[PDB]
Design a protein around this ligand. Sequence first.
Ligand SMILES: CO[C@H]1/C=C/C[C@H](C)[C@@H](C)S(=O)(=O)NC(=O)c2ccc3c(c2)N(C[C@@H]2CCO[C@H]21)C[C@@]1(CCCc2cc(Cl)ccc21)CO3
Ligand SMILES: OC[C@H]1O[C@H](O[C@H]2[C@H](O)[C@@H](O)[C@@H](O)O[C@@H]2CO)[C@H](O)[C@@H](O)[C@@H]1O
Length: 518
Amino acid sequence: GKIEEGKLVIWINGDKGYNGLAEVGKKFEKDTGIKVTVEHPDKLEEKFPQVAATGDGPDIIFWAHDRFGGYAQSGLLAEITPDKAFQDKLYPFTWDAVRYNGKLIAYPIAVEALSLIYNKDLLPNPPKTWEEIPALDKELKAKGKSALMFNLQEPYFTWPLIAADGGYAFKYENGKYDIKDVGVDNAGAKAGLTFLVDLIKNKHMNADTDYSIAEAAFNKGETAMTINGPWAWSNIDTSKVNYGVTVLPTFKGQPSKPFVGVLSAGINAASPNKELAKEFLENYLLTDEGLEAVNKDKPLGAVALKSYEEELAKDPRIAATMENAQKGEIMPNIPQMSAFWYAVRTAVINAASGRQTVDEALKDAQTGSELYRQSLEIISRYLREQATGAADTAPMGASGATSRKALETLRRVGDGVQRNHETAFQGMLRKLDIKNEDDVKSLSRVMIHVFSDGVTNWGRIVTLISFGAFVAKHLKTINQESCIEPLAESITDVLVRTKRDWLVKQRGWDGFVEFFHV
Ligand SMILES: CO[C@H]1/C=C/C[C@H](C)[C@@H](C)S(=O)(=O)NC(=O)c2ccc3c(c2)N(C[C@@H]2CCO[C@H]21)C[C@@]1(CCCc2cc(Cl)ccc21)CO3
Ligand SMILES: OC[C@H]1O[C@H](O[C@H]2[C@H](O)[C@@H](O)[C@@H](O)O[C@@H]2CO)[C@H](O)[C@@H](O)[C@@H]1O
């Protein structure tokens, strides 16, 4: 579809201050005559990339910054170009959160971190350690209360415990991510998730607890503690619970490490209202008055706007938010975050329910989180060596035996396919008439149509990749060798997005190697 010119449609999550945001919209309308519609659809972070890819969706999307790199990589976001005067009004680290491939892709709004929230009438002093919670629950159960309830359906809430003893998403060293180094199934991650599963086994928590259930229990005074972000404080205020906000408990003597989000506002690349969107965000929302309107509805956390943050920083709840943030880590914004979160979501739910053991659950999560990078390594190497006649001398890196053996297998089976099906391959090549980088960009749709709509098996995956090598050879011969790595990226994207679940179920590329073992 087509986004309508002369209005603004905004999407924001239903846990945020969307009524406050709508008030800012009304102020904008009063000056400009432009109606601002604020919506909070379910699963908006999944809906956005689907609808925006067709030139549809909201003019402005609000989410934590972690999702925005994927959106930017997909061409769904307009580049943000504020002047120096405006940029200087926000904290530099918040702009860093919304930078992707050297470009600003959103406006930062506020810094969010989970804290421990406790009922002072039940628990005058909160526990300093996770390890003491079982004994505390026993004391409280005898009085008809429980120690702790929080959302076990979203891995955002369990991550601080998984990370505490050494779990990590993507390793960060010497000022850089090693995207090849994933820390989801190490001893530290296992210890944290085992502690969570044991809480459930011992009836201190219930696997089915979600956001609404935990919120209701805390706000009714039934449970002594919860884990939540600043947005939750409004409903607690309304409940009149005598609450405190504090540092998360330690695990094995180490801080809980929340993944820190920067609520950010991106402009849809398909919007015909980009100038209106920039005006709204810079001159209405990111002002003391604008942020106050949203914050009074549901608190934002530590806002990006320096002038207003100076007022808010005096609040002990914000001090606690920032203490927890400093103990955690700013989320990456790399496109692979979506897959990481899906993988860990499934692991936590399956481990909590008993569907998988902790070891089984985190193994699958590691495979899911590594899948893009490993698939690209294999596919890129095969395409490039096929096109040039010479292999890549670079070390395979992480999980290198699997990558090496997969590439060996692919050489054997993929060369066979190209030989036996040379006629069909040559015919399809000529039909597609691939001349340049723009023509390569058009293949994704065709690949999804032909590949993804068909039986899922390793044979069809070999055809996908082998035909890719056939195209790569063609690109080299016509002096378009620069198109090969984009092509490999495109093939990988199609494969891992459309066959994610199946691939993880096969043990990924180890399954491929076993399937074609001579
Ligand atoms: C009938 O004519 C097809 C040949 C089939 C022989 C094959 C052995 C079957 C018996 S099979 O094993 O069942 N596999 C598939 O049918 C199959 C799986 C994946 C595919 C395809 C087929 N494609 C159509 C093929 C290619 C040769 O003739 C078609 C290519 C594909 C769509 C075009 C654009 C494009 C661009 C890039 Cl870079 C990469 C891939 C593509 C998508 O990937
Ligand atoms: O649970 C995975 C989930 O975590 C984060 O989402 C948070 C969000 O940042 C908060 O603003 C608040 O709305 O709670 C969400 C968790 O339910 C990531 O930002 C998100 O991408 C990820 O899927």
